[PDB]
Amino acid sequence: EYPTVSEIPVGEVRLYQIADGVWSHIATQSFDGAVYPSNGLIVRDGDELLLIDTAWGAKNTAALLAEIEKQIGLPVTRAVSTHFHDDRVGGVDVLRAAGVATYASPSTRRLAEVEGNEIPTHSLEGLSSSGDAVRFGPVELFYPGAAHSTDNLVVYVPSASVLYGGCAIYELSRTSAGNVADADLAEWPTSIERIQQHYPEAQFVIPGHGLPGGLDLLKHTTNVVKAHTNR
């Protein structure tokens, strides 16, 4: 079963096999007085591993690397952060110290600097405008437009039809937007429409936080985001 928030003490990381050579990583962290789960992705990249997002903090990200070594045993050589918040870049300094080359869009690197968050080393080119897609090893990176944040990326694994939505996509059980300080509520539904249009074949959809689902998570997120904008 997919691990839930109460099953992971803060500081531990679980891996979940989605498909051949495709895993999510699940961690937990405190935020605004509660503890929340958070997802990232791991994709086999030949003899190496590509990491999508940190495990939300230095300690968790160190535990992530240890669990990957224990369970998969291939080196993590590159990591992409899908936006500038701490559940995506928190732990980049640990990754860099471990020998991982860290990447993000120029916007994400800039926003992380402005916010005082950790800054991935390398800039991803070709993602500056809504609808842009680039290949990065075994995945496609897609910028759908502003949503959860202005810089948020999504990631698609063609070999398994896996769509990692990041924090732009909510889990089914989440019925409120909660904290949306950095969101673009007006653009979020349009950005979700671009995801739907670009990845209509997605079979597994991973939200930034919580349980995987299918393309229904896109319509669900639009519902929640709009309901928040109505009142």
Ligand X SMILES: O=C(O)c1nccn1Cc1ccc(C(F)(F)F)cc1
By CB under 5 A, name the binding residues for Zn ion: 85, 87, 167, 208
Among 52, 167, 205, 206, binds ligand X (CB under 6 A): 167
Residue 16 contacts which entry, ligand X, Zn ion, none (Cβ below 5-8 A, type-dependent): none
Report CA 87 to chain centroid distance, whole Å. Answer: 8
Annotated active-site residue 216? The verdict is no
Contact 158, 109 (CB under 8 A): no
Would you tell me the crossing angle of helices 188-198 and 216-230 to the nearest 10 degrees? Answer: 170
User: CB burial class (10 A; 0-12, 13-18, 19+) of residue 153?
Assistant: buried
Lookup: tokens for 85: 């918040």
The DSSP call for residue 7 is G
For ligand X (CB under 6 A), the number of binding residues is 13
Amino acid identity at 183? A
Residue 210 contacts which entry, ligand X, Zn ion, none (Cβ below 5-8 A, type-dependent): ligand X
The one catalytic residue among 53, 86, 117, 148: 148
Q: Which residues are annotated as a binding site for Mg(2+)?
A: 12, 138, 171
Residue 129: φ, ψ to 5°? -120, 145
Annotated active-site residue 198? The verdict is no
**Shortest Å distance, C-beta 45 to ligand X:** 26
Annotated active-site residue 148? The verdict is yes
Does the protein bind ligand X through residue 37 (CB under 6 A)? yes
**Residues with catalytic annotation?**
83, 85, 87, 148, 179
